[PDB]
Symmetry: C8
Subunit: 146 residues, 8 copies
């Protein structure tokens, strides 16, 4: 029942592939808003609570939670090869498969394996969008060794 | 009997449970908002009031009283590989209710030692300071 | 022998098992204390013993429609009396009631607050000021300080 | 035993509160006090907030006149029913005007033996002693009290 | 040009007369309605003057306080001032006599004055000028007791 | 007879009115008249009073006003209210500081007391808003002959 | 290709650029507000939303995506005497975008060593902490004369 | 062309009006006239005054305006109000710093007093908003 394709190249997705994914996850109701707002792969991966509520018209916190549940799954299994030269995806995944979801957040700030050692807690929260403290702490700890 | 597998519940099972606990009045809201097992387990005061239309603080308290019961006697085996449920339960039967909170952040027995008070509150949704402190204490001494 | 509990003023029954009270017993108590005007609200909101013991200023004002701060103060004055003389045996295995009562009879009113957070005699030594305020609902600083002091001087070995 | 000199305000009922309001020229407020069921206990514990919002006394000046009368009543009231350790005389010995704080202290369950441990925050928040000068004097004298 | 007026004992009628003398007859009605007597007049605040007595202008309030300060400077405080703080304050600076009622209303006297803090003189006694507070405090610490 | 430095502390409403005309603020004559602004009040005028009580809504207009008032304050005769001649003391430091005379004497400061003054007092009690000015006045005050 | 001299752009060149990036809808606002190269380079979230009428946060993100590209491949020679562009670019090509922010405060290579984190954020408009930290680090390991 | 050493501190309303025309802000002439903006007020103009009192609602328009004002401040003659020639001192540090002259002299600063100035004073009293500028001015002031 998992949305197809599996292991998708979400960074390179255009509006059309975003549209298809919305259908697969049962969010067809939001296709129009996503289309109007021209959400592509890059924007989907970087979507915030605020943008989802205000710009895409998803008023319910519960609906947003359902949406982020699906987005997290997509992010966890996505192919980041185009944008992830140092393979941060595998580094994160080795710590915990669930951490792979943070790949785009890290590479979008221009982080890579070599720079990761220097990263701060604030940076992981504000710049990389890692909201769960537990996750931040684990990633921080493992980054300080390498 | 056998404990219900709430993490795997679909909308229909949530609907059934609302009827059983005398909250039929809220079936429509829960249906509209597409509340399944996962969302039911993770429900907040805020979502209950704003998104599900449960305006009364007293009614919400009654609801959480029922939800805590359900959480206490749920089967978490699908999502709880390290059996945090039994660990929590051994400390105090009432702590079993926090199983889904902990496993949803990817915690297990081995990782538990490193958790902070802030994390148990903000990430795991353990609101009572007393409960946090006891869980924290026991986690550091299993280490 | 200052036992006004045998007096006519004091609501009947004495030494009631408030934790197990249902809507009907709550209704009876409201009548006795001269709060019949609020019977309908309490009925509609389905206030039982457990909810009565846990009632907050906010719930009383917003959910039960008691707009006056003075009326709420009168209400809490009555609820404090009830809480002081209630039977907590079903929910108080370690007898925190007597521990609190030995400190000061008026501290018995905090029993349900403490047992509701899963405190017992053994755990009491570790309790913090924040916990007594936020978790147990002990609003008077004087009371918190005395309870805290006595808790730290407990023999846990 | 008909008429006492110092009134037992803690034991006053609605009717005695009503009579007192008349005597002090606040008849206009009798209905509000009746509706709100103000007895001796509630009268002694009345706050600025309750007076303005619940009793409808909108003017700060009117409230000041009211508290001027209440402070007198509190200063000369008989607290014997509720003041086992006689904190009234302790306060009075410091300054007669401080007797007005008796009910505030005994309502928190303070007594002579517990006074040494009381904090400035407690005197302000729990006992309702708003004047710093008064708090400081009470605190100072309380440091030379014997505890258990 | 009243000689030692006993303002603490003044009734409504004397306050009314005073308002007339200082050219504030416009405010007689409000003062009457609010039942301002000597005690309330001496303890009047900016807030009460604006909100309860309807003196909307800050400039008018300033004029009023200018007159009140004069009255306070020349008043007889003997009913309420057993230790004669009035003369003590006046000897320091004639302009300090105006603070008598503020101090004696809190139960202060010559013997207690030394224990007061700058915050207390502001919050409890209504001495708004820091310069005045500091001078009163300093002199209080150096005074002769019994 | 015409004095060189005007005795602004002793000015009455009529002199204030004249001054408003001279500086091109005739538009405000009515407000000043209604509010009964005399010399004392003119010297003590605040931004707030000027905006709310005198109806000068524009911050630019208020700036023009204060530009004129500062000049007046700088060259005024303070002899009635300045027994210790703080005006000349301030003037000796910098002629522009003479504008603070009424601020200092209104708190009851004089040459002998000046040594004890604090930064907070110069700001809150004396109305010296410019840090640069406060610092210079404070410094010079500490190094005075007591 | 040729790198455009965006610092010297006039309204007309800004209008052309808006067309090329698919933001023709906003041409009128940018015209009305008289946005030239200097103002384009210094545009803030606030100005974009309030003054230029770009209500959607998503749309603003799309816009800044394009502006960042422009800034990355702009010619700054008129205003960048010490060639901070190449210094930034050597660290990471993506840092070239911060050139105008730095030169607008009157920073150059020689002054860069002394710069503070607060300055990079408030004065230079470098919003990403990661970027700030890297730029700060590299600035401290320069020539200190 | 571009005016040589204009004596902006001594400008009257009429000169301010002319300058608004030259920089293409004729639209605002009326507001500036009504508000009686002269040289002294122009040099001391704030964001707040520009928005609320002069009716310049757009942040972008205000930015354009300050861009022009900065230019004017950079090339102005301050001699009437600048006895110690702080203008040339600031200019020698960096031509762009000349713009701060009126801010400094308006607080009564001069060359001799400059050494004692604090960061807070440069920001709050003198209106130097850029930290980079403050730091450089502070540094150079301590070393002369």
């Amino acid at each position: 029942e998992v949305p197809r394709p599996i292991l998708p190249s979400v960074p390179s997705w255009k509006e059309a592939e975003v549209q298809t994914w919305l259908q697969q996850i049962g969010f067809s109701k939001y296709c129009e808003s996503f289309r109007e707002q021209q959400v592509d792969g890059d924007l989907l991966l970087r979507l915030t609570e605020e943008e989802l509520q205000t710009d895409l018209g998803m008023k319910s916190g519960i609906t947003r939670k359902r949406f982020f549940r699906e987005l997290t799954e997509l992010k966890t299994f996505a192919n980041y090869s185009t944008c992830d030269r140092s393979n941060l995806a595998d580094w994160l995944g080795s710590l915990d498969p669930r951490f792979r979801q943070y790949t785009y957040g890290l590479v979008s700030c221009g982080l890579d394996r070599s720079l990761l050692h220097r990263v701060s807690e604030q940076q992981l929260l504000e710049d990389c969008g890692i909201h769960l403290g537990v996750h931040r702490a684990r990633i921080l700890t493992a980054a300080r060794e390498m």
